[PDB]
A paper describes a structure:
SorC crystallized as a monomer, which is consistent with size-exclusion chromatography and mass photometry analyses. The general structure was solved at 1.4 Å, and consists of two domains: a Rossmann fold FAD-binding domain (residues 9–185 and 302–403) containing a binding site for the adenosine diphosphate moiety of FAD, and the catalytic middle domain (residues 186–301) that binds the substrate. In class A flavin-dependent monooxygenases, substrate binding generally initiates flavin reduction by promoting the out conformation of the flavin. The crystal structure of SorC without sorbicillin shows that the oxidized flavin is already in the out conformation. This allows a passage for sorbicillin to enter into the active site. In fact, two poly(ethylene glycol) molecules reside in or near the entry of the active site of SorC. The out positioning of the flavin also generates a cavity close to the cofactor that provides space for the nicotinamide to enter and allow reduction of FAD. Analysis of the environment around FAD revealed that the cofactor is in the out conformation. Trp300, located on the re-face of FAD, forms π–π stacking interactions with the isoalloxazine ring, thereby stabilizing this out conformation. Furthermore, a flexible Arg201 residue provides additional hydrogen-bonding interactions with the O4 and N5 of the isoalloxazine ring. In SorC, the residue Asn331 promotes the FAD out conformational change by forming H-bonding interactions with Gln197.
Sorbicillinoids are yellow secondary metabolites synthesized through an elegant combination of enzymatic and spontaneous biochemical processes. The flavin-dependent monooxygenase SorC and oxidase SorD are crucial in this interplay, enabling the generation of a diverse array of functionally complex sorbicillinoids. SorA and SorB work in tandem to synthesize the hexaketide precursor sorbicillin, while SorC and SorD are involved in the subsequent oxidative processes, including dimerization and oxidation reactions.11,12 Specifically, the monooxygenase SorC catalyzes the oxidative dearomatization of sorbicillin to form (S)-sorbicillinol. The oxidase SorD can then use hydrated sorbicillinol and oxidize it to oxosorbicillinol.
Numbering used by the authors: 8 to 437
């Protein structure tokens, strides 16, 4: 039988599992936790990601749309957060508009746990094994198949292993090692502060014009998004502050404990003190108690490939990214689509040698590697533009606009269907 082991039931692994289910490919999800938890973080999914969801199966996109929210329409206003003019009262000030970014096909955000809960409904219970904390991968002496070994002391067998086990992937460690110079995520030097406030309260402070649309407020060393989310009657305020310092290292298997700290209330206040009243007002709407999220990415120490032998990486295990152009989870869905399509070809074949399995995964990598690396770099650059790292873009709006629009187009208007046919063509070759 041809068996796919998916290590990790995050967004990437769950999306892949549904794609395989709907293509009649045998798989098992091995998840280290007792359940998929309840992490509430908000993830924004872009058009390219929504197309890949649909292509996996319409129920993946439906799972998403059932729990997602958005502003009215797909236009985002990019403003200069410093040089708002006219008043200290945002209700009568004039936002300093740089340009508008129109998102063809729109974007939506959801709580991660809500999307997880919808997707999991579509996966049979007998396809998910909890408390399976993958520790190592070896090769079976008799068969040459992968042997998974879990911390509970048990093993499993598979023809291919898909590491969907996130930013601190054990599958990645198995492939490429753990030493100080190994592929790994590192701090991107950006801290996330975010909150939701009742939409009517935001309108009372900022006025209706400034709560009518999504706005990204650029400025020196930090930026903030104010996004009115209609279906939840809330204004989402998402600030990112650049931090030249290192992130303190904590020994923990919990990614929350690794990448989150309590935030002293004055941190956001200080970062935005030189901004205009709209930004200072928005930031003041954060709860006095909040958390900060240290964003890590794989820009500096990327993996050299997504596949080795019968093992591969997808999602944040492969290409953890800053979220400056949308949640990096979107690319886990693109990865999942390619894997679903290639693995369906193997699942149909009378026999699949280790060579053919390995070549299949290599094809997956050939199709996704360059684009995936591009996102990690482009997203980091986007942060640099929005925080005026190199130049005051408040004073060069037209230039800024050309740069952001171009990179947005390459990401969001990607040929999803062509990616699949490319994969199947190359698979043929190999
Ligand atoms: C605190 C925090 C805040 C975040 N905030 C944001 C945000 O604001 N915006 C945004 O876009 N993204 C955010 N993210 C990231 C987002 O959750 C992920 O990008 C998204 O879930 C896609 O990642 P993934 O599915 O590839 O992997 P993950 O979501 O990391 O899923 C990995 C899964 O594999 C399991 N696993 C790990 N190791 C093993 C192992 N050895 N054996 C078995 N199972 C294993 C994990 O338990 C988990 O279920 C945040 C993440 C964290 C931790």
């Amino acid at each position: 039988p041809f068996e796919v082991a998916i290590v990790g039931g995050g967004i990437t692994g769950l999306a892949l599992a549904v794609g395989l289910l709907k293509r009649n490919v045998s798989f098992t999800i091995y998840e280290r936790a007792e359940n998929f938890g309840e992490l509430g973080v908000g993830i924004t999914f872009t058009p390219n990601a929504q197309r890949a969801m649909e292509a996996l199966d319409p129920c993946v996109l439906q799972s998403f749309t059932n729990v997602a929210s958005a502003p009215s329409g797909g236009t985002i206003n990019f403003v200069d957060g410093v040089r708002e003019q006219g008043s200290e009262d945002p209700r009568t000030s004039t936002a300093a508009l740089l340009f508008q970014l129109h998102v063809k096909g729109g974007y939506k955000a959801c709580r991660r746990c809500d999307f997880v809960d919808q997707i999991v409904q579509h996966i049979p219970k007998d396809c998910v094994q909890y408390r399976k904390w993958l520790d190592s991968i070896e090769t079976d002496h008799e068969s040459g198949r992968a042997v998974l070994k879990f911390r509970d002391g048990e093993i499993a067998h598979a023809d291919v292993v898909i590491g969907c086990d996130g930013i601190r992937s054990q599958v990645r460690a198995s492939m490429f090692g753990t030493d100080e110079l190994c592929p790994r995520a590192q701090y991107s030097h950006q801290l996330g502060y975010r909150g939701m406030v009742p939409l009517a309260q935001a309108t009372a402070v900022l006025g209706p014009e400034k709560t009518s649309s999504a706005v990204l407020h650029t400025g020196p060393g930090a930026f903030v998004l104010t996004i009115p989310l209609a279906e939840v009657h809330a204004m989402h305020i998402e600030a990112f502050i650049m931090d030249k310092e290192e992130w303190p290292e904590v020994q923990t298997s919990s990614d929350s404990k690794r990448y989150v700290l309590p935030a002293t209330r004055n941190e956001a206040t200080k970062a935005f003190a030189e901004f205009g009243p709209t930004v200072r007002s928005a930031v003041s709407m954060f709860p006095e108690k909040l958390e900060k999220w240290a964003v890590f990415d794989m820009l500096e120490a990327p993996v050299p490939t997504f596949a080795k032998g019968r093992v591969c990486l997808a999602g944040d295990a492969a290409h953890a990214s800053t979220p400056n152009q949308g949640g990096g989870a979107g690319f886990g869905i693109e990865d999942a689509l390619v894997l679903a399509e290639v693995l369906a070809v193997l699942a149909e074949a009378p026999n699949v040698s280790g060579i053919v399995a390995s070549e299949a995964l290599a094809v997956y990598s050939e199709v996704r590697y360059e684009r995936s690396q591009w996102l990690v770099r482009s997203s980091r650059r986007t942060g640099e533009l929005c925080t005026w790292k190199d130049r005051d873009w408040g004073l060069a709006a037209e230039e800024l606009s050309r740069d952001i629009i171009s990179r947005s187009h390459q990401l969001w208007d990607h040929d999803t269907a062509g990616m699949v046919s490319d994969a199947l063509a190359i698979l043929g070759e190999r």
